[PDB]
C-alpha cells in the first residue's frame, strides 16, 4: 500500500445497480466467472507466497541524511565543506524533482478520475501544481548542465537583488 | 562499496588534491619572488670566491 495523504483520493461513490430491462447483462456473469476462475486461484497463490514471506521476515530502511552546512556557510574554495554542501544540494535537488513528479501524478490522476467535469473539479490540484512549478522554476531553472549549489546561490542572489530593487522602486 | 566509503574516500581525495593545488600556487609565487629579488636559496648564480684573493703585502704599496 501507500500513504493516503500524500497521494489523496476522494471517496468512491458508486451507484447501486438499478436494472430496468429483463435481459440479463453479460457483465454480472463475467464478473462471477472472473471471481470463480481467476480471482480465487490468484488469491490462493498469493496467500501461499505471503505465508512463505511470513516464514522469514526481515527489513530494509529509509536512509536518513543529516543536514550538513549548506553552500552559504562554506568558505570560498574550501572543498571539504563545499563538497558536503554540494552533495546535500544535489540530494535536495533530486527530492524536489520527485516532489514535482508527485504533484504531476496528483494532477493527472485528478483529471482522469473526474473525467469530463475535470476543469471545475481539479482547481485545487492545478493550483498546487502551479505553485510547485513556480517554486521549482525559481529554484532550479536555467542553471545548465553543470549545475551546482554555487550556480543556484548565484541565481538566488540575482533574483533577490531583483526583488529588493522592485521593492525599492515601488515605495 | 558503501556510500559512506565512497563519500569519505572522496573527502580524502579532495583534501590531498586541494593541498597539492595550494602548494603548486605557493611554489609558483615563491619562484617568482626568488627570481625577482634574488634573496632565496634558488637562482643563486655564481659569483667570484673571495678566498681566491691574495691579501699578502704586494710589491707596490698603493693597492
Q: Do residues A120 and A108 lie in contact, with contact meaning Cβ atoms separated by under 8 Å?
A: no
Minimum distance, in Å, between the CA of residue A102 and any CA atom of chain B: 26
Cited resolution, angstroms: 2.9
| Interface contacts A/B by beta carbons within 8 Å | 13
d(CA A117, CA B34): 81
d(CA A84, CA A79): 8
Helix or strand run (H / E) with residue B8: helix B3-37
CA A82 to chain CA centroid, Å, is 29
Could you tell me where the DSSP H helices lie in A22-148? 26-34, 40-54, 79-114, 118-121, 123-140
CA A154, A159, A163, A168 torsion-angle sign: positive
Q: Do residues A34 and A41 lie in contact, with contact meaning Cβ atoms separated by under 8 Å?
A: no
Contacts of residue A74, Cβ cutoff 8 Å, sequence gap at least 6: A81, A82, A85
Minimum distance, in Å, between the CA of residue A165 and any CA atom of chain B: 39
Restricting to B residues 2-31, those with a Cβ less than 8 Å away from any Cβ of A are 7, 10-11, 14-15, 18
d(CA B13, CA A170): 51
Nearest CA to A97 out of A156, A147, A159 is that of: A147
Tell me, yes or no, if A87 comes closer than 8 A to chain B by beta carbon.
yes
Q: Which residues in chain A are contacts of B19 at CB distance < 8 A?
A: none
Nearest CA to B18 out of A77, A84, A81, A75 is that of: A77
Residue with the three cell numbers 475535470: A118
Amino acid at each position: 500500500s501507500w500513504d493516503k495523504d500524500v497521494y489523496p483520493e476522494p471517496p468512491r461513490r458508486t451507484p447501486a445497480p438499478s436494472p430496468q430491462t429483463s435481459l440479463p447483462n453479460p457483465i454480472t456473469y463475467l464478473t462471477k466467472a472472473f471471481d470463480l476462475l481467476v480471482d480465487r486461484p490468484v488469491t490462493l497463490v498469493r496467500e501461499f507466497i505471503e505465508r512463505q514471506h511470513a516464514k522469514n521476515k526481515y527489513y530494509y530502511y529509509h536512509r536518513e541524511f543529516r543536514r550538513v552546512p549548506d553552500i552559504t556557510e562554506c568558505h570560498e574554495k574550501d572543498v571539504l565543506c563545499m563538497f558536503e554542501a554540494e552533495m546535500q544540494w544535489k540530494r535536495d535537488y533530486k527530492v524536489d524533482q520527485e516532489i514535482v513528479n508527485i504533484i504531476q501524478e496528483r494532477l493527472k490522476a485528478c483529471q482522469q478520475r473526474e473525467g469530463e467535469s475535470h476543469r471545475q473539479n481539479c482547481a485545487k490540484e492545478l493550483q498546487q501544481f502551479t505553485q510547485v512549478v513556480k517554486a521549482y522554476q525559481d529554484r532550479y531553472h536555467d542553471l545548465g548542465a553543470h549545475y551546482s549549489a554555487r550556480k543556484c546561490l548565484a541565481k538566488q542572489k540575482q533574483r533577490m537583488l531583483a526583488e529588493r530593487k522592485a521593492t525599492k522602486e515601488a515605495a | 562499496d558503501a556510500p559512506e566509503k565512497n563519500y569519505e574516500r572522496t573527502m580524502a581525495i579532495l583534501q590531498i588534491e586541494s593541498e597539492k593545488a595550494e602548494l603548486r600556487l605557493k611554489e609558483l609565487e615563491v619562484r617568482r619572488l626568488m627570481r625577482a629579488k634574488g634573496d632565496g636559496p634558488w637562482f643563486q648564480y655564481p659569483t667570484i670566491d673571495k678566498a681566491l684573493i691574495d691579501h699578502s703585502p704586494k710589491a707596490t704599496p698603493d693597492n
